[PDB]
Write a protein that binds this ligand. Structure first.
Ligand code: FAD
Ligand code: FAD
Ligand code: CC2
Ligand code: CC2
Lengths: 270, 270
């Protein structure tokens, strides 16, 4: 009996995206998960960080710094009721599903803001315990994305280039960075040009995947241990590590590709 | 003379970003440029896609689809007046500058939403002429970014990983997709640790660059001519091209790395 959070980001109950989340929650429940949702549009959600994210007095209103004030606000418990109720949903979850349409090659603005407003220092990340040492280490996150263009268009020779680089800033920068383990993305390509019968199976496969999803092995990111964590060493990869790698033909990651070959589907397949 | 448009996405008049936007406008004016602004936060820009973007009447309100509904609104002149004003600024502009702090390894949610509401199909991109043949092919954009992390953290060895991969979805996907000639990003690392006297230098270096911006050499992107531009062919790289690259050490760019080694600083250097 674990705990799932489904974050949607689509205006229409009409959308395949909405179907995807409804399918997501049904599957989850019949296997006994308790499920909570953040339907951003339906929530009248405000996606813009500002001082107004802070209940009371600002430490230094003369020179507003979002990072420090929000953190303080988080500690003293002075955050817009808004943010508070989301942050709670998070700590309570084991799994977090992010459901969205790909918009300009990343997350919708409203989803982006949700990260920016909900993922507050101390609560979600730490400068000390960055990445795989994050507060979310006990949790798993996954992107379920739908797309206009085809797998072909997003393949190594496709006009849009590799979908793995496009996934990187989000899956690593935003999910792994907070500690999350990230499962392979669910990618629904060319959803506008999928015959009506494939679209009924896709929803079904998604539901099957969900039945055993806690047991999947996650995407691979280069451990934080491979790096010297300070401004002295530059947060750089240890010499001993940079050395074992001299003769390995593939980089470690998309981000840590090292001028070498990116390991096939590093951001798409475990 | 020539025209610039400076889109800014920071809330504080006291920030280095606002300062940076000022310097650009200042320096650019002293050359003869006509400078226009979008201080997103000051304009209280609405960043959220919705049916309220179409003033007219929906072709198909039952199952609402933003792409086609918005593109039709475009053609007929039924786009919401605030979006329209933004688009007139883009038409007029020869050079567009995006000034912002890197937030969660990308663009502030308000800038994302600005792209989503204002880059409407057929106004800003053509499915029949994606990328280098796009509407804005006659203009030039540049990203001006400030960061918390140091450049070291964003080197091939840095904990955050190659900054070129991070710049990719924005420079190719958002800017270049529209036809933009993308110029080298102005990268200001860890501005919040930069000695007071140092920040003045950066500020004036920025003014110095802008003196001769229009003659810069743009970042390199695979020309669309390398690809068969139709869905039947999967928008795959041309057969002849694929062969005449089989014996090339390096990929074409970050997205078209072809599973080989990425060329150094492809999203950072011309
Ligand atoms: C602003 C914007 C930016 C975009 N950027 C990109 C981009 O960068 N790259 C890219 O590749 N694409 C892009 N597209 C994204 C593409 O349109 C979306 O990623 C995708 O369309 C999301 O699909 P949807 O949920 O809205 O599908 P829908 O519009 O809802 O359509 C899905 C199909 O499934 C049907 N359907 C609906 N519900 C069900 C159900 N319950 N059961 C079975 N079938 C159902 C629908 O009738 C429809 O035929 C962009 C679109 C927009 C508006
Ligand atoms: C939500 C969020 C997410 C972030 N995510 C990331 C991330 O993913 N990766 C990352 O590396 N970083 C991240 N940071 C990014 C980092 O905060 C910004 O890039 C950086 O803070 C931008 O500085 P600023 O202009 O906003 O702030 P400021 O502190 O205002 O920068 C200006 C500095 O120069 C001084 N100054 C102001 N005006 C002038 C002037 N005219 N001349 C000289 N000095 C001046 C100011 O006092 C200040 O010391 C994040 C920050 C936030 C809030
Ligand atoms: C930033 C952006 C990227 C996109 O990428 C895409 O692949 C598609 C799908 C697509 C784009 C162009 C031609 C097509 C042809 C057939 C099927 C899908 C096609 C988009 O509709 C699309 C829309 C926007 C706003
Ligand atoms: C998503 C995110 C990424 C970040 O990356 C960074 O490199 C820094 C700067 C930074 C990060 C970690 C340790 C530091 C130590 C000293 C100075 C800056 C330091 C961020 O403050 C930061 C903040 C957020 C929200």
């Amino acid at each position: 009996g674990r705990r799932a959070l489904i974050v949607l980001a689509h205006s229409e109950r009409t959308s395949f995206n909405y179907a995807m989340k409804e399918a997501a929650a049904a599957a989850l429940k019949k296997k006994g998960w308790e499920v909570v949702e953040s339907d951003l549009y339906a929530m009248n959600f405000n996606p813009i960080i500002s001082r107004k994210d802070i209940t009371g007095k600002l430490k230094d209103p003369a020179n507003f710094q979002y990072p420090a004030e929000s953190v303080l606000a988080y500690k003293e418990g002075h955050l817009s009721p808004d943010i508070v109720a989301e942050q709670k949903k998070l700590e309570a979850a084991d799994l977090v599903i992010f459901q969205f349409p790909l918009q300009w090659f990343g997350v919708p603005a409203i989803l982006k803001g949700w990260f920016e407003r909900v993922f507050i220092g101390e609560f979600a990340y730490t400068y000390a315990a960055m990445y795989d040492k994050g507060p979310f280490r006990s949790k798993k996150a996954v992107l379920s994305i739908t797309t206009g263009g085809s797998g072909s268009m997003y393949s190594l020779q496709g006009i849009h280039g590799d979908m793995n680089v496009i996934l990187w800033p989000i899956q690593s920068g935003i999910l792994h960075f907070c500690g999350f383990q990230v499962l392979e993305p669910q990618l629904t390509y060319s959803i506008g040009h999928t015959p009506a019968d494939a679209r009924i199976q896709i929803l079904e496969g998604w539901k099957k995947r969900l039945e055993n999803i806690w047991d999947e092995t996650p995407l691979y990111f280069a451990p934080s241990s491979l790096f010297d964590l300070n401004f002295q060493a530059g947060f750089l990869m240890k010499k001993e590590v940079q050395d074992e790698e001299k003769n390995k033909k593939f980089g470690l990651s998309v981000g840590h590709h090292l001028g070498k070959s990116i390991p096939t589907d590093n951001q798409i397949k475990a």
